[PDB]
Structure formats: structure tokens, C-alpha cells
């Protein structure tokens, strides 16, 4: 078993001054309307209908 071939893949992640290009998945809750709710559409934390 120890002499059998094994495939090894190594992942490396680095940070530079460039804007981030690789991002993980995001979640999305259901849209409720005509009610005083709070939303955050990527630019503001607005509360309202």
C-alpha cells in the first residue's frame, strides 16, 4: 500500500496589492416586500420597505 502511486495537488493562496479576484460563495435570503425590513445590497445598510 505504501509503494502504490499517490497523486498530490498543493494549493497556495497569496495576497498582493491587486484587488481580490477569487472569492467564495455568498448566500441570499428570500425577498420580503411591503414591510419595514433591513437590507444590504452591497453599498448601504438601509432599513425600509
Amino acid at each position: 500500500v505504501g509503494y502504490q502511486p499517490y497523486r498530490v495537488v498543493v494549493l497556495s493562496f497569496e495576497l498582493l496589492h491587486a484587488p481580490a479576484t477569487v472569492c467564495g460563495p455568498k448566500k441570499s435570503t428570500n425577498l420580503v416586500k411591503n414591510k419595514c425590513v433591513n437590507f444590504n445590497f452591497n453599498g448601504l445598510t438601509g432599513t425600509g420597505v
Partner: protein
């Protein structure tokens, strides 16, 4: 924008809607354009004269 003229660009107004966005983050100070020339049967086909 379609137009029917050779020179002396018209005084009409036409805004420029945005196009694709490049998140590169590099240095830039110089630029140059690219042109296309034709090699028909009239020309000998050499890029000298």
C-alpha cells in the same frame, strides 16, 4: 454612432455608456494603435515599399 461625414465632427450630443471593466492594477504611461494593410495582386507582396 452612425454618421455621414468625412471631417468636421458634428455638434450633436452623444453620451458614452460604460463598457467592460478591467480590474488589473498595473502601471501605464504609453500607448500605440494597430493598423491593417492589404496585399492584393497589384502590390508585389513585400512589406518594403
Amino acid at each position: 454612432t452612425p454618421i455621414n461625414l468625412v471631417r468636421d465632427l458634428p455638434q450633436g450630443f452623444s453620451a458614452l455608456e460604460p463598457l467592460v471593466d478591467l480590474p488589473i492594477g498595473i502601471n501605464i504611461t504609453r500607448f500605440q494603435t494597430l493598423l491593417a494593410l492589404h496585399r492584393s495582386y497589384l502590390t508585389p507582396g513585400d512589406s518594403s515599399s
